[PDB]
């Protein structure tokens, strides 16, 4: 009976990621990492605005690597740990549902070499013991997501769910994450903990290999920017959404229903979105199809927002953070009013 997790999630309208922020990797071992990818320092106002528009859930991606002391303790620099807490507290201040993750650890130590399972597990666990100790007293609105797209960057199957050995490794790491949090007690005893597949991929072979913890307070996270060629810019990509590629969304979702939802396993899409390609009307329709699909079974999603819209780079930006104005109200409206 995993119903407690379902109840908790049902409280979310739709979520929002604080992209390219605490996840950013410049600035070395300092709080300036937050601004190293060109975003402004996150404020209470920014989070209020997100929550006010109707994203009552927020994902705070964070990359810890440069802020860790040497192994085996991997002590999180106190300055970084406290700023992370300040950002989570912005959301706590507004009664929001929250996901804290580890993020681009994949650039550093989180390289999915099955031969190196213990070292990987131990580091994940050492980080999450400290994070869990820091957020012990936070209520059940705050959730943890153990890893972000854990994979072997540069590998042939980096973005297609990796290899079998790799996926066994992901099970080991998911277990280590859960074990290390639960062992800290307090509100972490029953905190929703969000595990993931290899790369957060949702292809049948990836899901088929996913071990499901018997811990009843978990959810499974996936990323689906589906279809890739609509949402991303690339050779073969398109900007028109007429419905003809909805089967791509549908088909993938049937796998998630088969392996997760229909077995009573909570699922969350902790990232999705569509890069802006001067095509408001199409995104709006894609949203109807994409999110409407998720809505059939009460599945929630969090939208990736890197605050990039006019500039160059992947144009997932929605909230203009400096102006506290949305870059595109029509796209936003479709997301917040999806129900």
Ligand X SMILES: OC[C@H]1O[C@@H](O)[C@H](O)[C@@H](O)[C@@H]1O[C@@H]1O[C@H](CO)[C@@H](O[C@@H]2O[C@H](CO[C@H]3OC[C@@H](O)[C@H](O)[C@H]3O)[C@@H](O)[C@H](O)[C@H]2O)[C@H](O)[C@H]1O
Q: Which residues bind ligand X (CB under 6 A)?
A: 149, 159-160, 199-201, 223, 225, 228
Percentages helix, strand, coil for the chain (3-state, rounded to 5) are 40, 15, 45
Q: Minimum distance from CB of 11 to ligand X (Å)? A: 25
Q: Minimum distance from CB of 44 to ligand X (Å)? A: 29
Q: Minimum distance from CB of 78 to ligand X (Å)? A: 31
Q: Minimum distance from CB of 223 to ligand X (Å)? A: 4
CA dist 284 → 17, 126, 165, 295 (Å): 19, 42, 40, 16
For the chain, how many helices (H) and strands (E)?
10, 10
Give the residue numbers annotated as catalytic, written as ranges: 149, 271
User: Closest residue to ligand X, Cβ-based?
Assistant: 199
Which pair of structure tokens corresponds to residue 5? 């997790």
CB 137 within 8 A of CB 92: no
| Identity of the residue, 201 or 307, whose beta carbon is nearer to ligand X in the bound complex | 201
| Identity of the residue, 72 or 154, whose beta carbon is nearer to ligand X in the bound complex | 154
At 122, is the secondary structure helix, strand, or coil? helix
| Identity of the residue, 29 or 155, whose beta carbon is nearer to ligand X in the bound complex | 155
Give the list of residues 6+ apart from residue 53 with CB closer than 8 angstroms, or none. 319, 326, 332, 336
| Identity of the residue, 53 or 200, whose beta carbon is nearer to ligand X in the bound complex | 200
Bridge partners (DSSP) of residue 267 are 220
């Amino acid at each position: 009976d995993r119903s407690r997790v379902f109840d908790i999630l049902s409280n979310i309208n739709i979520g929002w990621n604080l992209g390219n922020t605490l996840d950013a990797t410049g600035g070395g071992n300092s709080v300036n990492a937050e601004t190293s990818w060109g975003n402004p320092k996150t404020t209470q106002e920014i989070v209020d605005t997100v929550n006010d528009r109707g994203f009552n859930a927020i994902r705070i991606p964070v990359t810890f690597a440069n802020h860790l002391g040497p192994a085996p303790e991997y002590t999180i620099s106190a300055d970084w740990l406290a700023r992370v807490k300040e950002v989570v507290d912005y959301a706590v201040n507004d009664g929001m549902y929250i996901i804290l993750d580890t993020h681009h650890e994949t650039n550093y130590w989180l390289k999915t070499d099955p031969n190196n399972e213990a070292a990987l597990c131990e580091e994940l666990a050492a980080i999450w013991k400290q994070l869990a100790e820091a957020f012990k007293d936070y209520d059940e609105k705050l959730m943890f997501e153990g890893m972000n797209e854990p994979r072997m960057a540069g590998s042939a199957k980096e973005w297609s769910g990796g290899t079998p050995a790799e996926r066994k490794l992901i099970n080991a790491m998911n277990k280590a994450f859960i074990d290390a949090v639960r062992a800290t007690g307090g509100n972490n005893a029953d905190r929703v903990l969000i595990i993931c597949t290899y790369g957060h991929n949702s292809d049948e072979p990836t899901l088929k290999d996913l071990e499901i913890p018997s811990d009843p307070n978990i959810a499974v996270a996936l990323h689906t920017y589906t279809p890739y060629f609509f949402t991303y810019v690339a050779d073969g990509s398109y900007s028109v959404w007429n419905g003809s590629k909805k089967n791509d969304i549908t088909w993938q979702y049937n796998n998630i229903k088969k392996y997760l939802i229909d077995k009573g396993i909570p699922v969350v899409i902790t990232e999705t979105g569509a890069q802006f390609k001067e095509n408001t009307e199409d995104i709006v329709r894609w949203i109807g199809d994409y999110v409407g699909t998720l809505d059939q079974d009460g599945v929630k999603c969090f939208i990736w927002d890197n605050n990039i819209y006019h500039g160059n780079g992947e144009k997932f930006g929605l909230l203009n953070r400096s102006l506290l104005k949305w870059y595109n109200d029509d796209i936003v409206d479709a997301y917040v009013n999806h129900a």
